Symmetry: C3
Subunit: 90 residues, 3 copies
Amino acid sequence: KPKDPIYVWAAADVNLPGTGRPNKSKPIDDLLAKGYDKGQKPAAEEFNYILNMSSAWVNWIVNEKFPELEAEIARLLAELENRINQQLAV
Amino acid sequence: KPKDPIYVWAAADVNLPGTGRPNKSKPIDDLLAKGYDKGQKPAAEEFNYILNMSSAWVNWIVNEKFPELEAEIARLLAELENRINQQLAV
Amino acid sequence: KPKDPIYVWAAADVNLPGTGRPNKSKPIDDLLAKGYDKGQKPAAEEFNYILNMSSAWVNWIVNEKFPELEAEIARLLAELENRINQQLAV
């Protein structure tokens, strides 16, 4: 419904001149459980990684899982109807 | 399961008092491809837009897609049963 | 499919080490409808809360809601097939 195609944040993986490191790095699990506090300022890698997570997975849900699922349910119904059709034919 | 309803971030589409410009804007594609670096700094518009997109798509998945998919699933089976039972009665 | 095994951000619910307040808090709807404006100072509370909401709602859908729907589809199809099989056997 929303009028903008889902854009995956930091889709590409590359080195940044500022850091020299990959654009995305996994936050340490301590931070994942805890989060930030006043005074902390995020590192770019963790920010990019989190946004890429939350965008790529929504993209997957919308464009891969569902288009698969409607097709699968339709095919299931069609095959059940077909089987009952051979059963009736006799 | 999550315990609270899913609110949208920056739901409204209005000119901010501080800026006088729309509260949301698409980040430039180049920035999406790589994300922020050490020196680069976030703008308010992009920051709001990312979260708004995430929350809106989460709404569209949860409160819209599954209910209508379930309704379609029920309807398909009902129509198939009706079609079969017509012939069976015949 | 995404390679990331999604994780819940700020999954732990405890007061901040440097501040007695909780690590998460729902932003006032006033801000939710508008979004951060120029010169505002984001607080870790709201960022953590929104990330928690997004991550939890993503993983719930990914890991629970889809298997449930698939199981329901399978059971419905099996039972529907069985009904007509029995009736045609009669």
